[model samples]
Target chain A: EMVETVCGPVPVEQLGKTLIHEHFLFGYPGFQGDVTRGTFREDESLRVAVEAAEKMKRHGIQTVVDPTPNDCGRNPAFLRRVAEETGLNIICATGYYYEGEGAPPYFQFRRLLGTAEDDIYDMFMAELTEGIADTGIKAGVIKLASSKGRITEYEKMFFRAAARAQKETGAVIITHTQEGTMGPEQAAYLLEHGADPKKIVIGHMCGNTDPDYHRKTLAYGVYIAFDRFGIQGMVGAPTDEERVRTLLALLRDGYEKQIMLSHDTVNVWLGRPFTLPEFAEMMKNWHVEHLFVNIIPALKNEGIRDEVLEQMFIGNPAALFSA
Target chain B: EMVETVCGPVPVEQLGKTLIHEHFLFGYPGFQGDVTRGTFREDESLRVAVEAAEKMKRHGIQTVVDPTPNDCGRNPAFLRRVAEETGLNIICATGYYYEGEGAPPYFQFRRLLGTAEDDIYDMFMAELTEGIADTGIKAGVIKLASSKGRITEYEKMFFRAAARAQKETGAVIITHTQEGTMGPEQAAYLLEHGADPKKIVIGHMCGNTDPDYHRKTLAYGVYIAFDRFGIQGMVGAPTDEERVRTLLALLRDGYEKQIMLSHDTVNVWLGRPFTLPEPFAEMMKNWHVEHLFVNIIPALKNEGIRDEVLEQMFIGNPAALFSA
Candidate 1:
């Protein structure tokens, strides 16, 4: 069977030189109107999306798995348009974000109903089997996010749903760890819930500097996403420089195949305007191009073999989905 | 090859006894706050949706087309679940609602760039051919809408896009008219842009009391969605009694083939909190899919609507428009 896409499925092999985690367009559940910067522009958003995809295409990137969850204004139709216009393979996600400190009313209701786990399981299955909101683009990956320092009960429901979907469909599952919290717990939860380790990707591993957490999670034989390349100056996380250094250490530990890399970049704005001038100024290099432009050259300088880099960028991603 | 659904594709012939326009679950683009009634409960929503679908099922509504647009929390996943639980065919739409007054930045930018037409065309084409968001469920119909008075340029882009899509795919095009202002204009615009009239559905015509407007629009041989059946007391619209009177007149004028009926009901609440307490309470009775059970059919029988009226709504019109 072909690997289903927003623009219809292609051969899995055609997903060349992949970035496992990145967002073409996304927004918070309750942030459609900007209290400060005003509203969003679809034309500018489309422009940015087209330009970003085209730029990545020029640099030899072929596929991008956008893990923008359902509540985050995930527009598979828009992503399909971008894929069609740019000739890029775009795969969007189906799931919800971990609504950490400020969760949406939906999640609150999920808590109120007490069947959040079963409800989410059925929801994800329909998305994988039926489609998201009548779009016909089946989700290629299941995206789950955990709150900082803990997997809240709401987040645990999502984990259960993701695990159930993964177990049933063999669909690849990826994640977001707020400041690298709960990686080990996430892996164990999925494993306990019957998810195949090979199909699980624990993201934001780079956000935590501790080798123990990375090793601890990677020890489960699941993939670890060193996804936040070039995002710097966040508290309780290392810089991109240090992230690259830690990646080298993981490679040294013979965990090359266990790692995937991406910028986790929000390439375009969604319903509202959240990225203010200060935030934009801060995340200047936190884009899809940052990896190919800066990190690869830096890796080359560090004497990391091209074959190794190729394995992480190309081979590992294919193997993750294939498994 | 078949009309796509949240449950999967079904033969157009199998779209038995369909409601042309309804919302099972929906929300506005911006309105995700409110402490007293904040947060959306899926189980409760699903419970209400399942009950609504089952209630309509009892009255023979085998399929329901929810025209909730993308920006408005249009959850196809939820619709599919409801269909699975209640055993109903649920077809959803893929398109943006008309950005009338104080439009969202997304629409504003679409206009500012002057490529809104092309952008809309591409977006609709993808929804028809590909899918909505990574859901694999294709839109069976293209849902477009117009604001209160006229078709804005942005809304016109949507019309052009829907026309182009219908021209190419032969998929049915359904529309939303706020308080019934521009049915004829909407038809004229789509036809001018190459849409087949038989494949077009001009919705919310019940909002207009002028039988002349309804006759003029139906004269084009297009479908008129006499939706908003139980809904009453909105601005620039008649009561349900007036709407029922209008429907009987249209049937008397031999426009049965061109007319369809629905409540235009909002069955379930979505994310954020757009269902304000006062309006919610006021509109509650009209919101369920069962409005036809207590309000519509009783009115129809009182007016001596023929048994053919039942067949016209229950089977024939939905089949005819969906078939091609």
Candidate 2:
């Protein structure tokens, strides 16, 4: 990550080749033991991760939006260290993940105890405006997630809190709609919570094949992330060629400004290896470099214009942070 | 030592031949160095502890309360794991240790920064009422400890917090009276704040040989623990022969009703062993958690301590102490 970013207060508008919904490091909740098993070494792990960040800089990408939620081992100090060492503009998120895989027990216990002292809005506002916990590294975006099939009651509180953070701090909102269902409702719900439609991104829309699904969400005037490119052959996602067709479908209908690009590439995974070693070689193109090295050619082969694709990387990504 | 049990509560009365104080695993505050320095295998350590626990179950012991404090390697998830695997009811503690040997610097900094707002109480209440961290394995008791000579101000804050937790939830309050000095004040302070007399157990009384030291703490109408029973001569502790004399002194004086017995045994020492060689290996002879079953009970029988008195100390008083 050789790209130089400003040391203080680098606004998202000044970002270049910004990758939305990327993670610096991520681990599920119970991976706490993995560290105990001597899995995470800060010095070595962060060194390798710095090399991964450097690869993005090698391709002229500057910023990355790390939408890792609070429960998912989101370390502001880790992000701050990466930014200091690599000079890459890393925007950290302030919110919880979806209830299914998230560790919300501390807050959930408080909810059961009726302790309003644990307010989600204040948690988001505190991190968004001041700093995450005692670390003075403030968050720049409000990231949230809805459970698969629908937004759960526990997750709705986070969405509404991020919406409030958006209304107050004017921060951008990015979301995870599990496997691409209820994304239109995600857009509508954020709108109902008084969020400005333009600043919101409904992520993983690349997984849904229906153009009608694309039109229904884009109709809400909110942005969608064909963000998870190169994630193919499983779940609701298709290959990069099909991903290009979906991008072309939205562009052909003139919804170009409402799209953004980024691989959900994790620079370093925080625990024991959790990937399919069988699919090991198959995921070679799933790196952060997947967009420029692979997906761009697939777009050109389909006869899509360069500006439409570049708008998603350049003009469209910067506009997400603008008023 | 780590089974991760979530089976619904087993009544305290059902806790057969219970030992009020023990540790499946324990490390001091700064001993996180062990993981990096040594091969701290979770599988080997847990398997070794399960065998130790199985030995206790063979002796007809059904429950052992692990009062390893927060600063120590007091893992509820590990306790849950042990209970689930061994089918033994282990009551875990949710309070901090004494100020000197414990890690109070984190809370001390909170108090220094004026960030100490009813936080200690809320922390105890959360773990007691809900769960420890994200595990949802609720602690059945509150444990606290004071300094050697007296209760320090920092330690008193924890005492008040534990007292409040005891008051709110009817959870029992157990104390580590360092070197047996503050047993009386530990009893008095919890009484001053709202702890039930029956629900309080002033631990480590065996380390104090003086009958007056014994009588004074028991005079507060709280059960006293000669809990370091298996422990031989160490700092502030006497030999097992002296330990029995102290117990016989209490029983002879009609205070058998207010006594509980256990060995302050740790199955697996967490860090590079605190009791290094020269004496630790010899200490290991009596240091086994099973010494009560093997040595002390036989010693007690030789001293004319009858089955009814043994029943009172082992069975009757534990039920009474835990009775709400």
Candidate 3:
């Protein structure tokens, strides 16, 4: 038996007990000065991603939906390799990023075209139906971004695409946001356009001090990925204690079932010319990985029951993946 | 005669067309690594600021208030020398930065013990009454920061200080913000407390694309500083065309009286061990100053802003410097 889809049934083995909201084959800051220096040789980086995927297998990470869209770097080849090599179900993304920043010029075109739903459906359908590089691996989700609690024109175009894509293929949609303030506006935008708010996963919702945002997105029947768990020590981040307190508050408010957690940590910078290559080594050694091992245990100690842990790690992801 | 205040009558020459927000001293980012080499000398860097100030005379640029507050290299002595040598009015700032960045963890204590508002008033009284280091120049405006279009508890302390200081000393208050979203929120919060929205200047209004952000702030009667003009070339900035377009849009919307412009260029990268010797030149050359007059003026012409609008922003609005 396998998890069935329009492309074909993904082997049940490939359907791990857990999945995350958004995944990225790659990402870049756009205006980053040096492109080649930080360019990833797909083969080498996939080898490492496969290794991490394998580790997740020992712990049962069967599927991951990488949400790297246009500006952020969605690599079809890379997604295929990670899935084929690690035997995990890999989902890819299709859409644009925030306007005025991650977005290019002519964003107003997207707003005017207003056919984002059709475009998202067609583009994402092409990937899922034809398979990536003829490998027969279907894309699993639609990914998009927003800024400063406001939905820009480009994101509106993208959200429509995601909605139409999900409506057509039954694949899920996820979002990336800045500072977590855009949740209400994001949910309203997507739902109004046609995407089911309940079926979408909003990633990076934990990067803010606002709990009302979490509640609003949750009330829309969506999932909140409390991603970016480990990097609090890097740039300005909330303390673990603060995050837990907030998560617990959300849970008490009957919204834990809508919450998922991941580090979204790119342990390796995976480029040569652009950034210091050791960016990965630093990220790995610095924060992530602690989530699967230490942070969950700490959450348990802090009175988050195993039921809550299972929802965050296993049940919640599976349900969203199935969406 | 200088406008009388609790601080005493200050120099009228020191008072005209003074920019409430400027950066004569910018620190190098993370350049403190060279501190052991004695590369972070404030004295040498102060000379460069003095030179930049001297150059300011040709532009009729006086009263440069380098509001580089506490976390970002608030060099009192460097400020004093530049003020002394160039004869530019210099008003420095003392406050924390945005949350989660540059904010001291122990500021909770400062907020609680000093009763933030009182502390702000005290700082204001000192700068206006006693003067900075007994140099006879006082802080003419207070500066503060916020993140994500909203205020944090730490910033609330600063706003409280600003409001109290505004009520107590009538010095204009300015803000630094992330996402440029906090302009209206800041205006509401301050006005709710005790600040006169008209007297407050909102920094970096040009960072956002949504015109409502500008409309919202300006509607509250808060002054908008389109500082960092030539800076449109920097990472994640509105192009000069975009900036001009927005400015033209606002002017058409009848808010030129509330608009101000400057390049928030700095010398040292705040607490960086090394400081740039010629920040004004380096910043201008690094950016396109030609765009300011050439492209912007022509674009404004194309936008149909008559001479009256231009003069208000360039000449009249700044005349608030005299009364301020």
Interface RMSD of each: 12.1, 17.3, 20.9
Off by over 4 Å in 2: A1-7, A115-118, A234-236, B1-324
User: How far off is residue A285 in model 1, in Å?
Assistant: 1.3
**On a 0 to 100 scale, what is the lDDT of residue A125 in model 1?**
83
Q: Evaluate model 2: give its lDDT.
A: 0.75
| Maximum-DockQ candidate | 1
- Docking class of predicted structure 2: incorrect
- Tell me the tens digit of each residue's lDDT in model 3 across A267-288: 3342222222333444443333
For lDDT, the strongest prediction is 1
lDDT of each: 0.78, 0.75, 0.61
Q: Model 2, B246-320: lDDT tens per residue?
A: 888888888988888898888986643333345645764777778898888888889888989888888888777
The TM-scores of all predictions, comma-separated, are 0.53, 0.55, 0.46
Residue by residue across A1-323, what tens digits does model 1's lDDT show?
A: 35667887778877889888888886654334221122456678888999999888888999988988776668888888889889899887877777542333455454544545776777778777767665678888888888888888767888887888887888888888998789999999889989999988999999988888899999899999999886776535678878987898898888999999998888876543333335445567888789989999998998899999999989997888784
lDDT of candidate 1 over B55-160, digit per residue (tens): 8888878999998877666777888899889889999987777654222445455455455467667667777777766567778899888989899876777888
- The model with the greater TM-score, 1 or 2, is 2
